[PDB]
Amino acid sequence: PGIPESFKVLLKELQSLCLNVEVLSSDGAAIE
Amino acid sequence: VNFFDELRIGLATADDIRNWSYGEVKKPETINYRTLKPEKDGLFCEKIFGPTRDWECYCGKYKRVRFKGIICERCGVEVTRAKVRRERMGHIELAAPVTHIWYFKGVPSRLGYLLDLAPKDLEKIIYFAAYVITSVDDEMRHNELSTLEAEMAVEKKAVEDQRDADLEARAQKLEADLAELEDVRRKVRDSGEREMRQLRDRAQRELDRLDEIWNTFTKLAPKQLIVDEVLYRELQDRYGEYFTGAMGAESIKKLIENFDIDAEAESLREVIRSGKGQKKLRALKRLKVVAAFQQSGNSPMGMVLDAVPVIPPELRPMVQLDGGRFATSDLNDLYRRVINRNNRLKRLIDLGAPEIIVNNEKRMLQESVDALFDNGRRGRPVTGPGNRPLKSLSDLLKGKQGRFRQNLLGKRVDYSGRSVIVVGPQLKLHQCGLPKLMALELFKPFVMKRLVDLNHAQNIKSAKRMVERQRPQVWDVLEEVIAEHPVLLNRAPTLHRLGIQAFEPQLVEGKAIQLHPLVCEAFNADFDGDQMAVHLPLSAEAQAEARILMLSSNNILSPASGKPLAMPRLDMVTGLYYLTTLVEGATGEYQAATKDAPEQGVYSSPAEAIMAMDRGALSVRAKIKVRLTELRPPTDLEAQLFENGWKPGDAWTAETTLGRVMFNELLPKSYPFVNEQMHKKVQARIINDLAERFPMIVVAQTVDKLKDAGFYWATRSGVTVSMADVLVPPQKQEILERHEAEADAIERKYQRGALNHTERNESLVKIWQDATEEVGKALEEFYPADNPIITIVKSGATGNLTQTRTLAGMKGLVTNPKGEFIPRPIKSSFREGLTVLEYFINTHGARKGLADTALRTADSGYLTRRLVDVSQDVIVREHDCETERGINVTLAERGPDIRDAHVETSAFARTLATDAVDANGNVIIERGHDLGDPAIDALLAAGITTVKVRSVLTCTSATGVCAMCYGRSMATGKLVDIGEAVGIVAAQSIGEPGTQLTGGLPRVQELFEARVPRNKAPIADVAGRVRLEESDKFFKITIVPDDGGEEVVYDKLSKRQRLRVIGVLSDGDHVEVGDQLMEGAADPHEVLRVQGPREVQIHLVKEVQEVYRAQGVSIHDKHIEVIVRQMLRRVTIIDSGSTEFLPGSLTERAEFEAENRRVVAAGRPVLMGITKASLATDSWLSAASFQETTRVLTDAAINCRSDKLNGLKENVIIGKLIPAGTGISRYRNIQVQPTEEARAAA
Ligand SMILES: [Mg+2]
Ligand SMILES: [Zn+2]
Ligand SMILES: [Zn+2]
């Protein structure tokens, strides 16, 4: 199981609220 | 990939918002009213967002799936999946920059605390009611101040010249007018004097304006407001190159551009040191927001928007209903209002309009974006149809119907059914019955797979059709498919952990779920219409989790007291009670005849006895002497007979009942004999002994044999209710009427005038309660043992002596809806039937009870919710952190010269802190033993009156807890596992039996929410001797100290609080600092500050267990202690601070200790409410999900804090495997290779 639409919608909602939320591990940053 | 360790936030910069966006919307249009298609370069636009239909352009040239990653030259739409319409973010380029409402209208204002100005003044700057000064070139002004001062002196000399000129010009005219004139003249003189006075006043006002402009020009600096507007209008044209100012957001952008965070942050660290007092607090409130922007990678430039982002269309959808009418979302109207005013502003910029209309349009735009981001925050909300406020972007996130709350915590699920439950007593515990018509659909793909695997179906579609049609061939396969493929059964409300359980689905014909009778207590599910929800776990990992963790057989023991929850109740209990219970004067009885006959009631085998029973000769409940082989005898009879060899096929004689042998035949081979009537408590201790001694499968099976046998014998028990069977006590006439003679007499005392109505009203209650008691007793003296009513209650199956008393005899006194008892009781059995009045009085308490149990479930649910959301993070992270600290459990206080009643809750299933030293010092047991009864009785035998046990309370582990400190897990019955979410287990364990209370749940939620009690009973501040002076209906308690300080005195406490019983407290006694003074509830805060954390840690447990102990429930302390821990993991800071810490904040203990050392701070212990503790977290997602999403999102966004996802409630929200059970790296990344010795032959 990858990522729920219930996360993506919250991510995109917070991106639409102009809150720059970004995903990254210990070494290397991830992409949406 | 689905692997992101952490989650960082910040503030969206116009650059990043542009980088996000694929196209720019630049027309105020949604969808064409005629054709219902998206409009070009507007909202919902395919070119910028994504295609309406899957692989189809707007114009309709490219509609094939074959090609991808190409833009159509005509329209400009890219041909991909439609799902991108719920992904590809848009943007809007604002002609004038616009600030975010969150960093402005937030309390306190983040921009306001950054730039240091009043929010009422900051409002005026943003909403174009005042100019603000951005950058003053002080040097060039200072260098050329004197020339401008001289110009100002000439400009004063000019208005002075004008002033004297006009006065001179007037005076001569008035003198001339009066001279030509000479009531008629004096009036004209006065008018002239008034006019020249007005001309003087004008010159005075002008000079005042010039001097004011000079003063305000000499006093210039950045972040300075102008109210007049004409002053700035004058200061624009003259002295314009020396400074710069503006009005709106561009001004704040220009202020942020001309800003140095380091110097500002540094100065703030000095201004706090300089002026210690009230202003230090304000400077320190100002410090935190500024200090945050330094370490933050994102710049505070992004606080203002040049471009604003646009949410994916699908989350603000315009879908036509079955007819034509639109049920449009509000966001569309806000975005429309914004893009309209943006287009109009851009058109006003293109035109070259005056400043006023542009500033007004910028105010309108600002208000539109403000309303878009937060509606009904500033002044009035935006409304469309019928005066309802428009759902904003932030309104998606906030509220009970918020994204965080509603649309993330509870969802609908596929591969899942619901149905009505029926009993399935044929089924083994692990089995459950599934309705075949449900099952068929519920496993449709799984059965399709096997139907394509077999040569039943030629292709998938024919298998789908075959299973859809319900053809005869499917049924032979569906069992082959369902064979050991478990299902998760749920019964809402899902209170406790076992409220979900996995089962083997046996196919049944019908439309009902045949549940197991034992698991009904594990669901709290009656068969009174109560539905259950089946879920099919699909993954191998899920299938495993179901099979191992939560398969009903594997978890017999509740995660509460570690008592077997799946034990026999209701019928089974009376069944086994009848089965095993002994009866004198029975059939085939043991006689032991003299001279003539043999002993008769003696049988070679249980087989023989069964044959003697089935044939009319032997009664099951007869004290017969049977010779057994397969069964193990009682512990005393083990020694006296064999004491060397065992009994796999030996022989020994037992003086029992056939039923007790048929019972022991169910219990396991090596389990010894019972020879006793099987009361539900006896069953409880037996299945407990089986649970602690034997494997779990032995318990699962033996309790199932007890179920089957129990039910089989429940029938032939003869437990049936009849008007004959329900009797009345024959003295009920004598005992009741006598209790009239005492009552009526009081009336005869009242009519004369001695006793008052209220004392009479109580004495009546006493008398009729005594009357109720007399009947309550007398019933059992009369009622025979075999009586079904007596069977049902005295087995412990169900029902109480109260219910039997209110069924037969009388209900007694029943309560009013206030709580007060009605003085005239129900003087008649339900068997006799109540009089209309006696019934009508009974209705009150019953409806009150229904109204209370209606309230209880939701309150218990909320308590459960809070207790989960506080201890959501508390897992077993490591095995052992190794700490000597613990808690000292009572365990036999002075004697026998004794066992505590609450050892099982307090001591049992825990690891020992210290080596069990005694008077001699022959340490019988070392630290880290699971504390089985042997240990407890060995420590009682050893001669110690206290034992130190390791607690979560005193666990030195930073993250979660260590396995050893928690103790033996109740679910498993072994040492707790190194990933268990003991937090949620404890939470649910505490939360569930709130429904089984009546003081009660108020006291529980009051104690857990850590509030000031309803009865504020103080504690002793200092230890000393008590002396009490009785004032005018008041207690003056003074405690004379033993140490040598000031005596503790109290004055104004109510007379009906009552003193503690320690005989009773009076003058001439010595009281401890620890103990409570008066009856009621000790304030936790008071106990914490006086007796430290460890005492209040015990006090909470003691005061929150007593309610369960009173209401007949058993929770193990450790569960409470996981909450009482999560409470006391914070400190309130007094002064010093050191690293920008605030006075009267809530900071975590471990991270505070790391700062406290200060190698190159003053914090006190605090006890906070579980809601406050759940609010106080590092993970912004959880805090945002709990309450006040805006407040915490704003506070977090500025801080740019990186969420580690150490907590699991966030991992639920983001949807990654949770850090607990089977999702921790040491479990989820286990590499299992098959052994070379096994792989060799293969
Ligand atoms: Mg029910
Ligand atoms: Zn096209
Ligand atoms: Zn530990």
Side-chain angles (χ1 to χ4, degrees), chain A residues 1-10 12 14-26 30, chain B residues 6-12 20 86-87 89 100 102 309 311 315 335 373 393 403-404 407-408 1214:
Chain A
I3 42 160
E5 291 285 311
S6 201
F7 161 72
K8 195 197 299 299
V9 68
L10 189 78
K12 293 293 176 293
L14 291 161
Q15 281 188 342
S16 184
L17 261 305
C18 316
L19 304 185
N20 182 34
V21 299
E22 291 185 319
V23 280
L24 60 100
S25 189
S26 56
Chain B
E6 307 198 333
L7 175 59
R8 193 182 65 191
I9 71 181
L11 317 169
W20 284 341
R86 203 188 318 95
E87 191 188 328
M89 175 152 284
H100 208 317
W102 261 342
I311 193 173
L315 308 178
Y335 274 111
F373 292 152
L393 281 161
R403 176 60 66 180
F404 282 107
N407 309 300
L408 259 163
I1214 61 143

Side-chain angles (χ1 to χ4, degrees), chain B residues 997-1010:
Chain B
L997 306 177
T998 190
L1001 196 69
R1003 183 48 172 160
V1004 173
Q1005 72 201 56
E1006 182 179 61
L1007 278 165
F1008 275 120
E1009 196 72 288

Side-chain angles (χ1 to χ4, degrees), chain B residues 806-810 812-815 817-819 821-823 825-826 828-847 849-892 895-896 898-922:
Chain B
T806 185
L807 201 151
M810 50 190 282
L813 295 106
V814 67
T815 196
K818 300 184 302 308
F821 276 39
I822 291 91
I826 298 159
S828 281
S829 66
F830 272 43
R831 183 175 169 276
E832 281 175 29
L834 299 96
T835 65
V836 66
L837 301 182
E838 286 174 1
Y839 190 100
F840 190 81
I841 297 309
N842 190 71
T843 55
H844 284 266
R847 183 178 270 191
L850 186 60
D852 289 5
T853 198
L855 167 140
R856 211 169 292 171
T857 190
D859 193 1
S860 183
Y862 189 63
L863 181 67
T864 306
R865 193 151 197 285
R866 291 174 283 173
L867 263 74
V868 163
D869 283 22
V870 68
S871 64
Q872 74 207 10
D873 294 348
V874 177
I875 79 176
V876 179
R877 283 282 180 186
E878 56 173 301
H879 192 105
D880 197 354
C881 60
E882 297 182 39
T883 182
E884 203 74 48
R885 296 194 198 82
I887 55 167
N888 290 114
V889 188
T890 53
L891 284 156
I898 184 171
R899 278 170 43 76
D900 188 54
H902 311 102
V903 292
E904 178 53 40
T905 61
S906 63
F908 275 60
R910 307 181 74 164
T911 55
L912 294 164
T914 194
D915 298 324
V917 71
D918 68 324
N920 182 34
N922 68 343

Side-chain angles (χ1 to χ4, degrees), chain B residues 46 56-63 71-79:
Chain B
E46 295 178 29
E56 262 186 46
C57 62
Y58 177 58
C59 46
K61 303 301 188 299
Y62 294 125
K63 62 170 291 303
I71 306 165
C72 188
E73 62 263 36
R74 283 211 66 179
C75 52
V77 184
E78 194 155 32
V79 46

Side-chain angles (χ1 to χ4, degrees), chain B residues 491 524-530:
Chain B
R491 189 257 166 175
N524 195 18
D526 286 37
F527 297 105
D528 57 27
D530 297 330

